[PDB]
């Protein structure tokens, strides 16, 4: 059975979206480490906008501290904060 | 403000798991160069997050296709909203990574 356009659109549009991040590619300056788990869960920007012009972006953002062990291999290893930035409210506007 | 988020949570919430994610139709589709698409984009339930091993990659083992409504427009030249199938990953496992 189809996904009906009305119920698309609506749940495409530019909003914050739970995705997931490699913080390595996040971060490329933490080279000496891995870490576990690889990877967390942020609330970020996704979605179509009205206008091939527009793109969608935020405009509120925040902190979320995490747990992350910290992994230099074949040596010491450590549980550790990390800081990440989160979009809590989007909005379509014009490319550039 | 917000305490930290405690790492049995992470680890829970990030491992290798189907999540609802946005895809470009025009990515998907590259085929489609003389139509623009309203949505640009779409929601697809698609494999993503960490394994415990830097060896390991986290990729679909069931896969299925849903059918969804989509307004096809060749620009100054209007439209008409038709079906349009999509690939979605209904299971995920982490499994070691030959690439």
Same mark, same amino acid.
């Given at each position: 059975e189809?996904?009906?356009?009305?119920?698309?659109? #609506?749940? +495409?549009?530019?909003?914050?979206?739970?995705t997931?991040?490699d913080?390595?590619?996040?971060?490329?300056?933490?080279?000496?480490?891995?870490?576990? &788990? +690889?990877?967390? &869960? !942020?609330?970020?920007?996704?979605?179509?906008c009205?206008?091939?012009? !527009? *793109?969608?972006?935020?405009? *509120?953002? +925040?902190?979320?501290?995490? #747990?992350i062990?910290?992994?230099?291999?074949?040596?010491? #290893?450590?549980?550790?904060?990390? +800081?990440? !930035? #989160?979009?809590?409210?989007?909005?379509?506007?014009?490319?550039?």
């Amino acid at each position: 059975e189809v996904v009906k356009f009305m119920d698309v659109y #609506q749940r +495409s549009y530019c909003h914050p979206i739970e995705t997931l991040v490699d913080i390595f590619q996040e971060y490329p300056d933490e080279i000496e480490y891995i870490f576990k &788990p +690889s990877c967390v &869960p !942020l609330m970020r920007c996704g979605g179509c906008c009205n206008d091939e012009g !527009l *793109e969608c972006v935020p405009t *509120e953002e +925040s902190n979320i501290t995490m #747990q992350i062990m910290r992994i230099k291999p074949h040596q010491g #290893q450590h549980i550790g904060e990390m +800081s990440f !930035l #989160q979009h809590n409210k989007c909005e379509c506007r014009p490319k550039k």
